[PDB]
Amino acid sequence: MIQLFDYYNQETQDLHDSLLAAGYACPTIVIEANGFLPDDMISPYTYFLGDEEGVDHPLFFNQVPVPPFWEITGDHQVARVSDMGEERARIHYASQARGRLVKQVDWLDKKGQLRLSERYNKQGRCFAKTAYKSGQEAFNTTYYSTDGQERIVENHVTGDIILTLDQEPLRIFKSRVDFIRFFLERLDLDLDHILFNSLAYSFLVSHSLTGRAGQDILFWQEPLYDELPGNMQLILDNSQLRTQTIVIPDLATYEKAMSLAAADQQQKFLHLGYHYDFKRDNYLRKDALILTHSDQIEGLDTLVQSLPQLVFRIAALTEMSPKLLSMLSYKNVVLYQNASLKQIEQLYLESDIYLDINHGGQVLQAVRKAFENNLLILGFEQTLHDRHYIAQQHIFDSSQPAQLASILEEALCGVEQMRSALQAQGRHANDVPVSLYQETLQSLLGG
Amino acid sequence: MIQLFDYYNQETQDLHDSLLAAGYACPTIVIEANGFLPDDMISPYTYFLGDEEGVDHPLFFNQVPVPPFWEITGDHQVARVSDMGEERARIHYASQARGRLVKQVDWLDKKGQLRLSERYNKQGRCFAKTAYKSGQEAFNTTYYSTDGQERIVENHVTGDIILTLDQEPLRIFKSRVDFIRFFLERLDLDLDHILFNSLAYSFLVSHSLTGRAGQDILFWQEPLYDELPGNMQLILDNSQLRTQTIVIPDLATYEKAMSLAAADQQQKFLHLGYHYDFKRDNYLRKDALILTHSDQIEGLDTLVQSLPQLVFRIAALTEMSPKLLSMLSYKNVVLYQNASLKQIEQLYLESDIYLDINHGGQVLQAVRKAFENNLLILGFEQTLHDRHYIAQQHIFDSSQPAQLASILEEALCGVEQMRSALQAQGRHANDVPVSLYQETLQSLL
Amino acid sequence: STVYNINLGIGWASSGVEYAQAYRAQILRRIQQPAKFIFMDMILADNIQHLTENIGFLDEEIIWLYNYFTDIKIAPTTVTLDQVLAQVAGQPERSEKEGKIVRYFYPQDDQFITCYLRQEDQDFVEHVEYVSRGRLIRKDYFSYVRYASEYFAPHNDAATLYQRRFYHEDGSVAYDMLIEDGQEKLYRFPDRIFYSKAELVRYFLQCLQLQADDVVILDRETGIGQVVFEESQKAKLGVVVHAEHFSENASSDDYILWNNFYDYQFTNADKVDFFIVATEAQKRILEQQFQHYSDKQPQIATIPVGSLDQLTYPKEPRKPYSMITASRLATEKHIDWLVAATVQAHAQLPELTLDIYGKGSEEDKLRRRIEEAGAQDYIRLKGHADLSQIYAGYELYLTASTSEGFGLTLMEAVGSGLPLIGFDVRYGNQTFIDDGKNGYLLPVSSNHVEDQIIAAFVEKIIALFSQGRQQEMSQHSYQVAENYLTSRVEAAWTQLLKEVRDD
Amino acid sequence: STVYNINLGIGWASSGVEYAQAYRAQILRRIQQPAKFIFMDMILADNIQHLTENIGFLDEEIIWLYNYFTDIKIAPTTVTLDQVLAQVAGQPERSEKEGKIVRYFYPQDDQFITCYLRQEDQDFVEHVEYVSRGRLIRKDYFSYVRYASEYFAPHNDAATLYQRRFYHEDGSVAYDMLIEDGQEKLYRFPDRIFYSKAELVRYFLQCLQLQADDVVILDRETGIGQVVFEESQKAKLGVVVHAEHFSENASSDDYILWNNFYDYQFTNADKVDFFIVATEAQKRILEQQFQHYSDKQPQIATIPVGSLDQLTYPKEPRKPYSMITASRLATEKHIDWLVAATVQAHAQLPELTLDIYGKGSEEDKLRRRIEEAGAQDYIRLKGHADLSQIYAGYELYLTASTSEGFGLTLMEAVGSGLPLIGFDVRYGNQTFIDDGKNGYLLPVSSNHVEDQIIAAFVEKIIALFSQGRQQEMSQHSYQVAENYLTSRVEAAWTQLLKEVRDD
Ligand SMILES: [Mg+2]
Ligand SMILES: [Mg+2]
């Protein structure tokens, strides 16, 4: 058994974490060249490079090696390399709880166009450089050993992948599918079942294995619209392919899927969800927690005077403009500025709501961390995503019913007044029991 | 009396050179800030900066002072300054026979846009820097005394000329017309009659004084088309403006200068030509001269078989392609390349018919130089400018047949027919004797 | 052998860095150590020399960047309207004087020259603008001659700066620059052309021809840090740290976030010969965060920003039971905790009173509650006073500062004699206080909880007002003050230059 | 201390500057002055070692710019077809061989590899192209390892070089570069990034770490001129003049037109420590043109490009009245006249005979002209030959070329005791022909008119073929040649570098 995921992201982590809870621990393959992979997983691009497993000590933005005397600077969202004030590179931040960790540094020419992308892993090493031709089109990507030798050269124009491993002769793979396939055979992975999350290469590995016997499941996590993706058809229309099963954790689209699938054609759609591991129960207490980058929180003044019983805690690791420092005039508000990670954890204990009221960009997956801590989330239509975790009943217009939160919010007056609400956002995120996997699967998962 | 000349060029030199033949030599002022001016002309922009008069020794292209170690390269056409390989400045050549002389240097920014124009003079100094704003639009020009002071700073957006002389208070003029008049009244020149060649700032300095004693003229040269400028119409209609008398030297510019205007407009504008100083007679030596920047000289393959009588002298200042040097083995052809400036003077003295048959860039005012020595000029319908000096009995077809091109002037063997062709040459150039100058102007003083 | 101090700019009202410099200049005189002070910004609003001299800089110590390329000298503006009009032509019909802007009209063709004067009463013109037909076309700046001017043109019907020229004593052009988008994009010398201010600054420091025994001290890095580092490698380079170098709320056991003004210098510390911190509390920890995080061991030296001239022993009666706070008033102050904890300490203590000197933002809300609170008449109110001598007429001092890099009022306070209570926070309260001995340092939690400290203020207030301590810890409060006074400053400042150059 | 000679390219047909450099290497060896010979061009089509060894350098003497940054030695290509096939996975079905190209096919995968050999009769492989589905995706370059690789991708169905990479002995990446329009626009090192080849050459010259008594000798300037000048100032810089250094026709008493290949070096001569010209004739000319046109007096030294190990005396035959010419026959060297000049001197003298050697373009036409005017084959023509042994067999050498900067033929001709007859023109003729002593210098007009040249040639062929004077000039070739022996050129080099190292 294997799980083969195109990309690594939270949607594939949730799918992966759920399956693992239900007793599915197989090897997991991410096709993407991602440099920060959970030790759980591997990738054919990063697998042969010689990095030491289980090391997390990435580069800090100012540890990027630069020409002598060149100046590294950066804020909380990005960084820069300069020669005499002239822009040279962009340092991009790996999105982690810890900030300013080096993911990818983008070198420029003197006219400012992108030329190289040098990629960093969780161990702080640079394992890949991407080279760009004229239009800022990707030419190729080289993957280096820890000794600086070419292990993988992937030509992006032709698709050809040149694989040269140590003390082995040179192998050319005509396509990404053919490379992954070499990787599966090379590791002698048991192919009973391939569970995969997309219609990209992770599918085309299955579609091209029909000669071999086994059956695979596709967990379809993306949105649906007027039609089906063309390829989501050939799994319904063809009867011989290794994958005859389409799991769709999001309900709302499962209905849209059943809508567009023909009456004969809906036998293949299984529906499921994810099993979240929540960190603690609610307790219905008095305290607000908002994470903002800067102001102003839409309708804070409105909500705060109207419900003076509720504690309001707002945090940032930036510093706060006196525009908001004006609002702590109230003894009703508590404000945390240049907030520590330690401090931001404490507030996720001491607050049972998260109002998604702020403007600008999101602060360290705050909407998610609220959901994992069973804080009831509400906001207006300008929400910092994810929309995954907030129920429709809970969302508001952009101050059209400016406050209608507050006493819909005030339905916090006791135990099953809430227990309703957190099954509302609990349902909307498609929370299911670990048992629901066990039932929904072993009708398929044999071998 | 004065000569107020908008621009220096040869149309002005010929007009200036002929009035001195007629004894009209007076102080002459060119408005244009021109650093290469003959020793007898001045400009208000040039005068107060203090370079020793009479010195003509410009800068060679590789003498432009540049930051330490920067490299200067160039060809006969243009030079440039480079830092570690990347273009920084353009070095533009003064248009003379002597090559690669620095009239102005254009510095660029690292993105290649034009920023400064440092303007140079005959005496080898940079007397002006022009600064540019974002659009590559000119902002101001500073003119400097030889010791580094500011003398003139002209604002090209507001026109405001700020003039600060040595020891003198600083003044602010509002226009070049105001500036020219200060210049005139300052040297206290006698404003009897102002002889001026265009309807630009010069004429706005005559229309300027209409209330003041003296009467002046225009000499109109620039070619004319469907109809008159509004500005010669200002003065044909008005009687008491100080210019009422317009002459036009080129007869192909005049027949029409009436056709458009009524017979009332008509007392006003006289007629003339230029009196050129020719350096020698023809002598009908059977020799031809061709000065080319690069081949191929149109249909010359055709002429040379047809004229074994004719020697064809082809000279280029650079090297030429074996494409042409293949023709040397035609035994009536001689070739001169890496042509020396002196060597090419000899050829002008040894040939009597100038074919203007080459393609592309012409060479050191070659047609004019032929006309100056009574070379007979025939060329094809690429008649490389000047067309000024070509009678049209003489221009020919653009090589459709080249057969008539020669039997025209193959037809000149003895002494009378040659003559008749060269006044035809001289008449289209508007050659008049110095006598007619004194006749048409004796009326006015 | 010289000591070149680098800073960006200066102004009439200016702040700790400039005074730490101006102060530093005065010691460096007394040692005979020659020193210049370089200022990189473009300062035409005032004449540069007025600002330098006010803060106490001698004209022979001042290197202005844009001046250095001229023969003109740093000078006060001596040029008079009389002299200014000798240069203009025509005659002015009518003057007009509004404050310092005085102007004369030349209406014949429509002109005027607007003059801006150093002092309203005097005649010394700082700069003049020439307007013709309503448009500014020229602006000249004066010291004892015109040292520069500006050329303008209409754009969007707004007067726009396109060019700025700098002159020698005789009016010959030294160099000039192009202005587009309010930035200096080109500099043209006779023999040089430069496309950025960064590369101009390099030329300037190469023209200084720094050598092995000269010392470059960088007090501000913005835009010049990289070029100063490269051209100072031949010489001795040093970086001074004003305020706090890191951020602990963003740091961890493996990852430290420097303050964005020292990051380049710390990152590149192998190019720096030595560092200067205000307090040895800062040399203490920054030495180890260099050890823990980066494994680099740069030399760090403690050299206070101020000094005490003389230990101030008062000859008057010590006034028993009083109070004061002198700080630059804002929210960061937090003396509503000093306001309340005085009410909450007034119940048990006779006739106590504090004075609040310094004024500014938030002054409104302190007056708001000090009246409705219990001791209204016995807590003070009004602002600025020069307390140079008046500290000693007091008992104790009160600081709620969450941060002080170096306390300067504190600096004066211990020399003047007061015991001291403040939170235990970097670096000033920690270097000026022991919690026996001088005073009490209040440990502070990670967040604002008001009644935490208001009661925690009162308890160390009264432990000293109880005998015999109040004068006990005052009188040895000075045995530490004997290290922070001038002779010891000049010792280490002196001390530092020699072990820097024996390298 | 070492001498660094800087050149751009080299090839199989390489000549001029390169043969001069090769013998400067041979000289500098005996003097025991250690030298490196630097090449800046990107040479992949042949192993640069094969080219340098072909002209006589030792691999220990060669510095190639792009190899310098690696740890790989300059070495001949020893990688073999077997070793190349050993490291490609699979086994090829079929082989193909066309000249030096040998292709191996892998139809199972639809890929083939194209090996380019060194010699067709050996198995050594200089390059391998990897073609996947008819597309060139990679190419390797071999000496004793893979030292470089190129990566392609089709554009308008043309294989296009986008990137080139250089490796260490152990296979690790040394650095790579980005190709755009046949230009290398970005160089990426681990610790560096460079945006132009000029700035790359700078880093190269810096990595050389030139000391004060190192000597940098500039053989060619184009593209590297300024950077070699900026970086050689800390050492002793010198510039060699290989051709005529100015255009005389385009000059005057007022203005001189330099040769563009020397214009930068001449204009900046104030930055040059010494020049080097082939002939003392040229030393004096350039010496004054300096004095006249721009007053400067840079040191100019005279070293010959060649030399004679010994003077070869004949085997005691000389064919009565026989001549010799050896040139690379082209437009410029105009042997047309002297095949036509002696046909009239065989009239005035019975036994007169001459013959032409040398090989090149344009005189396929010669073999036609030989006797098609009725001349007869007592004027023999011979092709290519190495002539060291063959000059002494004749009584007279002959040259029609209009310009020579030095001449290598004349030196060996004179070294065999052959008088010369050539035009009076700079330089080699004026250097090797002492007029009347060993030969006759023929004035030529500023324009080439023909019939007088031939007549002036034949007239001095009988004045050099009637009599008593020829062996009584063949003296003077042996007279001038002893100045040209190898032992005396070793002297001038040792002295020049000793002089240079005292400033
Ligand atoms: Mg640099
Ligand atoms: Mg430079």
From Swiss-Prot, chain A:
Please give an example of a GO cellular component term from this record.
plasma membrane
Result of changing residue 222 to A = Significant defect in glycosylation of GspB in vivo and in vitro, significantly decreased binding of partially glycosylated GspB. Nearly complete loss of glycosylation and binding to partially glycosylated GspB
InterPro entries listed in its UniProt record: GtfB
Example GO BP: protein O-linked glycosylation via serine
Involved pathway(s) = Protein modification; protein glycosylation
Q: What is this protein called?
A: UDP-N-acetylglucosamine--peptide N-acetylglucosaminyltransferase stabilizing protein GtfB
Quick check: keyword Transmembrane in the entry? Answer: no
What quaternary structure, including any partners, is listed in this protein's UniProt entry?
Forms a heterotetramer with 2 subunits each of GtfA and GtfB. Part of the accessory SecA2/SecY2 protein translocation apparatus required to export cell wall protein GspB.
Report, from the record, the phenotype seen after gene disruption: Loss of export of cell wall protein GspB; transcription should not be affected. Non-glycosylated GspB may form aggregates.
List the subcellular locations: Cell membrane
Q: What is its main location?
A: membrane
Q: How does it sit in the membrane?
A: Peripheral membrane protein
- Domain of life from the UniProt record: Bacteria
**Purpose:** Required for polymorphic O-glycosylation of GspB, a serine-rich repeat cell wall protein encoded upstream in the same operon. A substrate-binding protein that is part of the accessory SecA2/SecY2 system specifically required to export GspB. The GtfA-GtfB complex adds GlcNAc from UDP-GlcNAc to GspB, attaching the first sugar residue. Upon coexpression in E.coli with GtfA glycosylates GspB constructs. Binds the GspB protein substrate; alone this subunit only recognizes partially glycosylated GspB, but is constrained by GtfA to also recognize unglycosylated protein.
Family statement: Belongs to the GtfB family.
Write the record's keywords in alphabetical order, separated by commas.
Cell membrane, Membrane
Q: Which organism is it from?
A: Streptococcus gordonii
Swiss-Prot record, chains C, D:
Chain residues that bind N-acetyl-D-glucosamine: 242, 405-407
GO biological process assignments: protein O-linked glycosylation; protein O-linked glycosylation via serine
Q: Which Pfam families match?
A: Glycos_transf_1, GtfA_EBD
What EC number(s) are associated with this protein in UniProt?
Answer: 2.4.1.-
Location of the region described as N-terminus R-fold-1 in the Swiss-Prot/TrEMBL record: 2-78
**Entry keywords, A to Z:** Cell membrane, Cytoplasm, Glycosyltransferase, Membrane, Nucleotide-binding, Transferase
The region called R-fold-2 is annotated at 307-503
Task: State any single GO MF term.
Answer: nucleotide binding
Q: Where is this region: C-terminus R-fold-1?
A: 196-306
Q: Extended beta-sheet domain: where is this region?
A: 79-195
- A GO cellular component entry from the record: plasma membrane
The record's catalysed reaction(s) read: L-seryl-[protein] + UDP-N-acetyl-alpha-D-glucosamine = 3-O-[N-acetyl-alpha-D-glucosaminyl]-L-seryl-[protein] + UDP + H(+)
Known SUPFAM superfamilies for this protein?
UDP-Glycosyltransferase/glycogen phosphorylase
Membrane topology, record value = Peripheral membrane protein
Phenotype upon loss of function: Loss of export of cell wall protein GspB; transcription should not be affected. Non-glycosylated GspB may form aggregates.
| Annotated residues for binding of UDP | 16-19, 328, 357, 383-385, 409
Pathway-wise, it operates in: Protein modification; protein glycosylation
- Where is it localised? Cytoplasm; Cell membrane
Give the similarity note. Belongs to the glycosyltransferase group 1 family. Glycosyltransferase 4 subfamily.
The text the record gives for the protein's domains is:
Has 2 Rossmann-like domains, called R-fold-1 and R-fold-2. R-fold-1 is interrupted by an extended beta-sheet domain that loops out of the structure. UDP and N-acetyl-D-glucosamine bind between the Rossman-like folds, which move closer together upon binding.
Q: Any idea what job this protein has?
A: Required for polymorphic O-glycosylation of GspB, a serine-rich repeat cell wall protein encoded upstream in the same operon. Catalyzes the first step in glycosylation by transferring N-acetylglucosamine from UDP-GlcNAc to serine residues in GspB. Part of the accessory SecA2/SecY2 system specifically required to export GspB. Upon coexpression in E.coli with GtfB glycosylates GspB constructs. Glycosylation probably occurs intracellularly. Requires GtfB for glycosylation activity, it has no activity alone. Does not use UDP-glucose as substrate.
Quaternary structure annotation from Swiss-Prot or TrEMBL: Forms a heterotetramer with 2 subunits each of GtfA and GtfB. Part of the accessory SecA2/SecY2 protein translocation apparatus required to export cell wall protein GspB.
Q: What is this protein called?
A: UDP-N-acetylglucosamine--peptide N-acetylglucosaminyltransferase GtfA subunit
The gene that this protein is the product of is: gtfA
